[PDB]
Amino acid sequence: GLKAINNGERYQLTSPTAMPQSASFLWNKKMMIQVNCRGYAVAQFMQPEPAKYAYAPNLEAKTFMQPEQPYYAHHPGRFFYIKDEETGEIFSAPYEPVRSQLNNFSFNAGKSDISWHIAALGIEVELCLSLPVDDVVELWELKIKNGGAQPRKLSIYPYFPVGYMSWMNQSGDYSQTAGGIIASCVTPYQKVADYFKNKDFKDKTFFLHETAPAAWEVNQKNFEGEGGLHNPNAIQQETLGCGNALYETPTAVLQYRRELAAQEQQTFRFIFGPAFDESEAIALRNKYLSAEGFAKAKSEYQTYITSGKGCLQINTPDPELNNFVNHWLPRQVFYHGDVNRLTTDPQTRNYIQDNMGMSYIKPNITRQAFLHALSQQEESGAMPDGILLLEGAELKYINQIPHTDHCVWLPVCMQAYLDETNDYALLDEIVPYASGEKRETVEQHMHHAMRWLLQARDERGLSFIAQGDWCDPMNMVGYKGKGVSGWLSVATAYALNLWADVCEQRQQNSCANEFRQGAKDINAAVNKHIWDGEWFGRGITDDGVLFGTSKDKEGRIFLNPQSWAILGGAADEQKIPCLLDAVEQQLETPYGVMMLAPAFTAMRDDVGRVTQKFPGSAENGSVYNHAAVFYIFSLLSIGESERAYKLLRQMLPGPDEADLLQRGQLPVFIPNYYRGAYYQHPRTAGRSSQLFNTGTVSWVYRCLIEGVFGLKGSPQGLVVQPQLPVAWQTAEAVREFRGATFNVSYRKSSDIKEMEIQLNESVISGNTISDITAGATYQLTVLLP
Amino acid sequence: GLKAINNGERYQLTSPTAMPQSASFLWNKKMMIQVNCRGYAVAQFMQPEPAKYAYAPNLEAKTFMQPEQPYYAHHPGRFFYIKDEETGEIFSAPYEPVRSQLNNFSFNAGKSDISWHIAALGIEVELCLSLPVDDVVELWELKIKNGGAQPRKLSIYPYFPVGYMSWMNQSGDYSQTAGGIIASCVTPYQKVADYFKNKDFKDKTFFLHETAPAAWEVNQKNFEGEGGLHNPNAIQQETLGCGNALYETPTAVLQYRRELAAQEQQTFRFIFGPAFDESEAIALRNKYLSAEGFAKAKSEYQTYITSGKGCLQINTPDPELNNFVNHWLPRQVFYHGDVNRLTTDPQTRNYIQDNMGMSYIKPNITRQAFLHALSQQEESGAMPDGILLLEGAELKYINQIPHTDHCVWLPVCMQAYLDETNDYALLDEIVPYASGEKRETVEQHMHHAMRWLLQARDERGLSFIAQGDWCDPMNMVGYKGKGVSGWLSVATAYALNLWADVCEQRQQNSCANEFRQGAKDINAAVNKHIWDGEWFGRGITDDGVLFGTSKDKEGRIFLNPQSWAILGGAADEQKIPCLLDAVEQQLETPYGVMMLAPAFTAMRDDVGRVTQKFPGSAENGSVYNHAAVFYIFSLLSIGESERAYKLLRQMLPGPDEADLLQRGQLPVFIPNYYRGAYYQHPRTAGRSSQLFNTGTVSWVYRCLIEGVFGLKGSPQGLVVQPQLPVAWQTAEAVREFRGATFNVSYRKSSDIKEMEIQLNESVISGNTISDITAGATYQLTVLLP
Ligand SMILES: O=C(O)[C@H](O)[C@@H](O)[C@H](O)[C@H](O)CO
Ligand SMILES: O=C(O)[C@H](O)[C@@H](O)[C@H](O)[C@H](O)CO
Ligand SMILES: O=C1O[C@H](CO)[C@@H](O)[C@H](O)[C@H]1O
Ligand SMILES: O=C1O[C@H](CO)[C@@H](O)[C@H](O)[C@H]1O
Ligand SMILES: [Cl-]
């Protein structure tokens, strides 16, 4: 079974084998943890760069998670063994490592915690994980209950494997003074500069108990012996051996021996995490490790998640959509803007898009993000590939490879901010540049961004692609300095059209004329060189070849040029239906729209690394949700309401059981992709990446608020412009906007020709609610033809 | 049980649980594989840089092996499941992954192959691995025999897990045309330059069958299902499902179904390895995958190992020493010089020391190695930190961190070469430098090396240490440009004394006077600033502090300054007994002599990274065998025969059972270390690193040939100068030298005062055999007081 519980606070899965990859996540200001239904987990924390405290059993590469992450028996996780001392029989919660037959199993994804209920051998177990807001520590609560009529003698053993911490130095032992196990390493390095760099690293891992245990074991190999994780030797004997680890792989295992009466339940608390030293661990113990510590953390964490609850609650005829939108969507948006994916150098397009989502959650965060981002703009007007969030941080990984699209996001996302808040006054704020002494207004920075995009174009009027644009691994189209991007061109025209509107709203008319004419010029160049007859091509290589065309067998059509040609005006009314039909014929699937098709099956070295990913995975033809939502936003922009909704709704798994089993994910987030290459590899199509980091969600939330429900801000107030799917005879939404609340009721009427809007029961003229008082609630009735 | 078999060709272990870390190795011109007794293996190959074909189940760091490598259930390995189709019962060879009760178990380390015999359920299994000389491929031979009286119906399943190959792209399927499983990936990267760099990578892994199987499975998860490795789901059912891997972790599993008659045995062959493409895999199949292919490979491989058999066969009263020396030592030496540890940039001291060992195996390799190394000498005279073996290779890892000792090895190791071969004419060969146009003789290059060492010294006359000397991680003594090394000083005096002797032998008398006076000057500076009263200190920091002294609590005495002070003459006859007693009191252990003591337990940042390794591991106070053998060589140099032998013999585990169990290794190699910190952590002391890469063995072989057996070359012929331990009443050695053979018999006589030597039964005067004819055999009798 799989369903929402607890009035939407949690989502419960009742089989540990039907959806074995399914997972949920938690975060806080400094860490995140992905937890698998069976007990495996991946946890990363910032200090201020990424690090971990629970390691693989080998030397792992520097990495958080892969799409479609595989697990394996020794993968890090969070486990408890229960042993009936009368019979010798054992089981483990949550399910791994023993995989015993259970009488009951529930995995509860929560907004603020992750929990399990399980039962075996007549013993009922509850396990609950949560995080505090501000510190790096896992709070664990274990309940064990004798559900039968006679007393039962049990051994209970937390098993929190620490793994292979370091080839240079790793160890562990029991600390009575800290009250638990302390594992210790030195992070490996060879350069003397790294010694100075690494000085404040939290290289100890603690596992601390509230309740003193009977015994402990810190040596992984001694724990398992010949029995392995299935039947550890240390658990077969009466008492743990109390061994340490001396340049041996450490582990955190405790043992409690209890005789429980009929119906008796006992509670045990633990904290697990990194520390610089034992004094930091004790500080966390004092702060957290108690009933009062746990309550106080949970109450503060609940407040934090509520502060990000967003601005739209819906009640539609689709209860799966209601649950997702009301409970899970705004939390996933909030994660992105509040902690920026836990990188010190967010990719610029990510930083701007994720903060765009915050417009609908905590717009002051958005405001500050524009100011921060623009302070790092180059004197030329160009934006850097990443935004540094800390003094001393550096550009890393893809951020070191020159991409060209970073400026385009500024007006695209600023538009959402200005529509929602009406904070035009942000345009007047003064910000420096990355170098030099110039300090200029936001508005002047934006002008320079748009002049950059106009100047970064070849003699045909098309934008240079260098080693990529929005498609990160599209790196061989323009690496020799001549290749251009189809997508970046049509997006630049959108960006310039939007910014020109803003300039007109601010009386900057020379700017409005310049950027409008730039957009026309680009669109004309697109129509002359990129349009391929039935859709727009993707780019032109360094050697003058147009790809993403009907003459290409693989990569015959890309989604993005089509969406953005719609948005930016390259696609006129005659071209639009060609676009729609080509997308439906070649890209639409039951799991959503693919970003390209057919997927590449071998390297094409005038396009690049994208073509080397497995066909159907990530940018190589997956249902890449962020590309799909740009298409949805484009469809909304031309009133293609039914097509927009159908494709948006495909992004949410369920309720169809085969769909749920095939995607393999809980419906508590949208992943960065569902596997594509639907025609070429149908067996795997739809499978979830399980990756909760995606810029998709800020756009999905925008599309629902402004597009589908049609409750959009303007300089006059709230514009009512719904595009509800025609199947809904009635719907409701509650919209928080500019400090007020709107209780909106939508209803289809036989007796009207045009939409009718009533405010507090009287008919308005026009479609804008203009008198909005902070703290007030308004009743809106929207009758639709 | 644990003993030599097959007239010394193999070494057999008969328990899979008593020594669970024990392993042996195989290599060839392009690869090496470490195989664990239980079936785990680590394999690396050169293409021309290091790579692998069997991967961990996660994203692993770029690495071969760690000291004291831990295993875990999903670690790469080489397995076969056997299923009784009548009962459902299963077991696996060699032992993992099922860990069933066996009726018989043997693990056979071989000079040329690795094999197992096991029995369970009345079925007898043999498994044999070998490599060819020149290609990268594992040759596997499986025999299955019904040992009972009735027919038996079995399923037999090779399980060669491929692991997680790549986040970008991984897959696998069955290829009828190749005749087996082909797994395929693209090695991940992001920089366009890496695409061009990676073009010839062997990114497919094959598992090819000689005999067509009933079924196959290429999806790891489908193979295991809920049963895991213990009881795979795919093996529970009647037939494998024949599934593929599509951006899923691949595996190589086949299924054979057989009814075997009473006493019937069947043989099955497979090859496993990397390939660029299916055409390369088929090429390997045609070449190797047959009875004739396997025989031809084995016969050619046996010839290759015999070509490296070395120059000394012994028959002493210690049969453990005989076995090691005769069978295992020369093979380990040969590996080092023949393939240079499978790095394209050997550390200079390693390249020179390993090739020194080749003096006794294939001296023309040594000769060529001096010429190659010197061609990369800098115009200053300094030697680079590594030696590049291929055009386009680069310095990597420690080779990028400035160390200062590289020149000292040249005369130290050249001496062994000249004594063994008498090839003084090498000195006249002309070689360029790393830059510039100068081409000069070997002899002139050497002069410039020794002038470098003289000039790289501070105002006190002591050698600069920069970021390390022989002790690789000793990086904070001199990183600010002032710190000096105690060891490098006393070694430089040795090197200069040796080279001066050579110059005198060549009539270069001005050179001999200059280098001799340099040595005296250094030794005087050592005695004034480094001698600490009872032993020599290790160095002086950038801020003027002498460490490795009686005032230091940790790192109170280092071994190396003492050995090399003996060799280079800083230690006079009054100091020597202080050295010996300090080493015995503070450094000697039952497992050998520690390199420093007590081990460091925390960072000391004017000494550096060495102090951060776990106490007892590697350079932080282990029995670091290469330091120990320098001390043994120093003891031989002053006729401390009993102490030299006792410490050399401690490097070989066994026959004491507690010793064997505690070190945890087969006696078929010397590891780079046995765990130290004997006083501080006695539980783990003696544990083998299991690392067969070590410069120890060229020195151990030298010490035995020239020192203990005392059969040493000179410009006059063979000098007879044995230092046998006094317990041996008789011994024999057969020595190959300058193309002749010497059958030497040693015997203790009551009736003489001085050694007496007879050649072909007549007494000689003096101790040199001077008339040596190539192809002749000489009988030598050495009577000793
Ligand atoms: O192929 C790649 O280079 C990676 O997929 C990137 O596109 C990353 O996913 C991105 O930097 C977010 O981490
Ligand atoms: O601590 C370290 O830097 C490593 O131990 C080195 O000393 C390597 O072992 C050496 O480069 C051989 O690989
Ligand atoms: O993973 C990603 O993929 C996207 C497609 O390459 C890119 O636009 C985002 O900035 C990046 O986070
Ligand atoms: O691992 C090593 O350790 C030694 C000690 O640091 C060093 O001298 C060798 O060159 C190096 O191979
Ligand atoms: Cl794209």
Ligand SMILES: [Cl-]
């Ligand atoms: Cl040393």
